[PDB]
Amino acid sequence: GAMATNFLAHEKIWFDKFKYDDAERRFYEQMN
């Protein structure tokens, strides 16, 4: 509802950060 929506809008947690960090790691590892 409105409360959860507000809380999440405020926190802006990057829940997908592990996906990005993992893709990025792999990307730079492969330039060898």
């Binding site: 409360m3 507000n6 999440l8 809008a9 405020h10 926190e11 802006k12 947690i13 829940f15």
Partner: protein, 215 residues
């Protein structure tokens, strides 16, 4: 009805989805569950364009029939996969079903959610969230208790969408916070709740349900 078949979009262990899943156990309808997550974009929860095409409110549960019929809102989905008996066989019974469904949504869902999960309400300045919700729930169980004193189910003489809906709305409370010393006062409501969740149609969706122990 028995012939309805389709895909129910939802995350698992969702009491709102449970309403349609349990109804389908009674009706014979074939409801399969697809649990694809939403996207989290910088504080915002979003769903795919295809999903929003069929379900513009972007909420789950949502249902797409194998013939392409789309419907959202957990009550409407549960209505659709139900049969005439669960919906109410007469305008009287049907109206009574709409009554308890509506009562569940307006009066039970808010304090039930708040008592089991008070964190958000407290953050938004509902200081006494827990004690306030506990009193509302006490009033609700007492209302059901008097009504069920002389009745097996809420409407007529068999399970309808009324029972399914109110049970699902009470499910977390009975699991998480309705202690024996608290629920003791509502033997009627407890009996009706136990009689519902122990039926095979409820059991198939809910599994074995452990009632809250002393905390």
């Amino acid at each position: 009805g028995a012939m309805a078949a389709g895909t129910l979009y939802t995350y698992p262990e969702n009491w709102r989805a449970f309403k349609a899943l349990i109804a389908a156990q009674y009706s014979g309808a074939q409801v399969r569950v697809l649990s694809a997550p939403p996207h989290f974009h910088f504080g915002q929860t979003n769903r795919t364009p295809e999903f929003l095409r069929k379900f513009p409110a972007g909420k789950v549960p949502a249902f797409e029939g194998d013939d392409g019929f789309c419907v959202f809102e957990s009550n409407a989905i549960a209505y659709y996969v139900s049969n005439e008996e669960l919906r109410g066989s007469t305008p009287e019974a049907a109206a009574q079903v709409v009554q308890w469904v509506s009562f569940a949504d307006s009066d039970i869902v808010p304090p039930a959610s708040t008592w089991v999960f008070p964190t958000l309400g407290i953050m938004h300045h509902n200081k006494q969230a827990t004690e306030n919700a506990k009193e509302e729930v006490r009033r609700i169980l007492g209302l059901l208790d008097a009504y069920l004193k002389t009745r097996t189910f809420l409407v007529g003489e068999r399970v309808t969408l009324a029972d399914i809906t109110v049970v699902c709305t009470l499910l977390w409370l009975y699991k998480q916070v309705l202690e024996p010393s608290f629920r003791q006062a509502f033997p009627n409501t407890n009996r009706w709740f136990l009689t519902c969740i122990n039926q095979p149609q409820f059991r198939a969706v809910l599994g074995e349900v452990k009632l809250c122990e002393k905390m």
